[PDB]
Write a protein that binds this ligand. Structure first.
Ligand SMILES: c1ccc2c(c1)ccn2C1CCNCC1
Ligand SMILES: c1ccc2c(c1)ccn2C1CCNCC1
Lengths: 196, 196
């Protein structure tokens, strides 16, 4: 009395629910700075995403948000990539199916500058120069900064790591708001409120 | 307006639901012989299980069933273990909180003999002897069989790999029956039936 095609469909429905639940959990961990919870949720999201072979426009946006937050999280720290985590986040950011509003351009430019600045902070100025060449192939001034190891120039005061994280966290808050109504989290919260 | 403790509770409720759903999916993949689906479901189960730090008596049984099926699946094929997959399945089997009925003892003895026989099938008779020593430290007859490379002796006709898989699959059917009513799969099926 069991139809394998209907069971495969029930598993894909459940995977879709688990995906949204894990994106919400990844968003809250990123917002709260819970590193180990972020790492655990990312692993679960990546594993659940393998149980899906066809994704809708909304599901593709969800996996790309998880991929984006994963690269941002590894920003100051392969596997098939010859670019830096922040350069990889920049490629995900520019190809998400989303409006290129002021907030999008703010995040994009903050990531572009921080991709260079995190290399300078870590003491690898040859890498900072290689990152600048891949992103920017202000250019003359920015190149002089890398060359002189001017890590604390006032340009990096406005285009700081903290500012990049603040703008990304505001975007994360919109994603948290949009996904708060998803099936899995909503049902889980009702169980918690009933206890209680 | 957000309580982190209540959100952590909602995530643990959802993890409990995802655990049961993935155990059911692991059970059907094992029963249907869907190897790649089994590998994918096992990875997701192992990742979701990390999002839990305190497990109930029922949840511990669920993770040990997943661990057991994983070792059985790798039977004919480390990571912190100096024993063979089937020897490791034998340790999980003997410590699950479950009645040691005729079916339990049938599965236990079939695994004990197959742990030796899979080494003989793979042509490693020194390993078959090392496995026999770890499990059996019939003994005199079984040791003569390994020594003479008597892989096709009639003892292995009754205690065959196919018989081991058949008895394990019957146990899997009981687990599938017991977990069919779990929240995640039940809700997923209702969506499929509504479409149809
Ligand atoms: C969350 C985080 C990363 C994720 C997913 C979901 C899905 C895929 N990935 C990457 C993609 C880049 N390489 C490593 C695996
Ligand atoms: C499904 C399958 C294996 C699983 C789990 C769930 C949870 C833990 N493990 C093992 C335990 C042995 N070492 C490798 C990880």
């Amino acid at each position: 009395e069991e139809d394998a095609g209907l069971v495969a469909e029930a598993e894909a429905v459940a995977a879709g629910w688990m995906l949204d639940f894990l994106c919400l959990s990844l968003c809250r961990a990123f917002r709260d700075g819970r590193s180990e919870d972020f790492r655990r949720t990312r692993n679960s999201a990546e594993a659940i995403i393998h149980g899906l072979s066809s994704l809708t426009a909304c599901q593709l946006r969800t996996i790309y948000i998880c991929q984006f937050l994963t690269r941002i999280a590894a920003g100051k720290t392969e596997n098939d990539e010859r670019i830096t985590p922040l350069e990889s986040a920049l490629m995900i950011w520019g190809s998400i199916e989303k409006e290129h509003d002021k907030l999008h351009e703010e995040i994009q430019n903050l990531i572009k500058i921080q991709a260079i600045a995190v290399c300078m902070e870590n003491g690898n100025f040859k890498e900072a120069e290689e990152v600048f060449e891949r992103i920017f192939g202000f250019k003359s001034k920015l190149l002089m900064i890398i060359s002189q190891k001017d890590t604390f120039h006032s340009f990096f005061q406005h285009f700081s790591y903290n500012h990049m994280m603040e703008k990304i966290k505001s975007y994360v808050n919109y994603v948290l708001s949009e996904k708060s109504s998803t099936f899995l989290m909503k049902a889980a919260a009702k169980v918690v409120e009933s206890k209680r």
